[PDB]
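Chapter review. Work through the record for sialidase before attempting the end-of-chapter questions.
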Amino acid sequence: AAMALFDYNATGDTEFDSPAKQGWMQDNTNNGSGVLTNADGMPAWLVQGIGGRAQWTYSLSTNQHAQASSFGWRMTTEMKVLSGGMITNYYANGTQRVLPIISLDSSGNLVVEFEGQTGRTVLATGTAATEYHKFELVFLPGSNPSASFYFDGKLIRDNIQPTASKQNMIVWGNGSSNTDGVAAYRDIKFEIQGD
Ligand SMILES: CC(=O)N[C@H]1[C@H]([C@H](O)[C@H](O)CO)O[C@@](O[C@H]2[C@@H](O)[C@@H](CO)O[C@@H](O[C@H]3[C@H](O)[C@@H](O)[C@H](O)O[C@@H]3CO)[C@@H]2O)(C(=O)O)C[C@@H]1O
Ligand SMILES: [Ca+2]
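Structure tokens for sialidase:
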């Protein structure tokens, strides 16, 4: 030991055909919604943050928060952004978060921002901007805790400093009631490491 993994895996299976059935909590407001969809012969969960917030949350236990802090963690998302912004797939711990905010800019490019930084980074232009990609957030602890962001396995930004936050969920989706955001999710993992 010791390691742990928490996931949503998009599936047609009845027993597990929403995130609610994989231990995640629906956390929409207003007009926000979601539904199982099927795209490339493959299930995806379509998050529809149109006129309301639309996201899913997962609760770590007391020891899991603490283990996450000692040994570090990795959050991987496989998604495709369809429209808008505040696509917020992230982890908060009662005290801090590394928040990447993903979107499509007014030129149609897939950009990423991080809370604590200012500016956007172009991840994909053209028809690439609105296809599936694999996004990794990798948190390395120490007395100098920083994060690294990866896009189909390519270091994009490192030395991302955590920022204060009272929230304490693993979250994915459109974490915003006013910024509309739409994306499809095949996979979410949050893995707590060993040493
Ligand atoms: C990623 C994340 O942390 N998302 C939060 C968001 C964002 O921080 C926010 O959208 C900024 O873009 O806020 C969410 O909560 C807000 C939401 O419940 C709205 C209701 O529309 O209320 C906000 O508080 C209000 C408060 O009611 C007012 O009295 C006061 O003026 O301050 C706020 C006005 O904006 C909540 O903060 C959200 O749902 O968008 C929660 C996300 O998790
Ligand atoms: Ca435990």
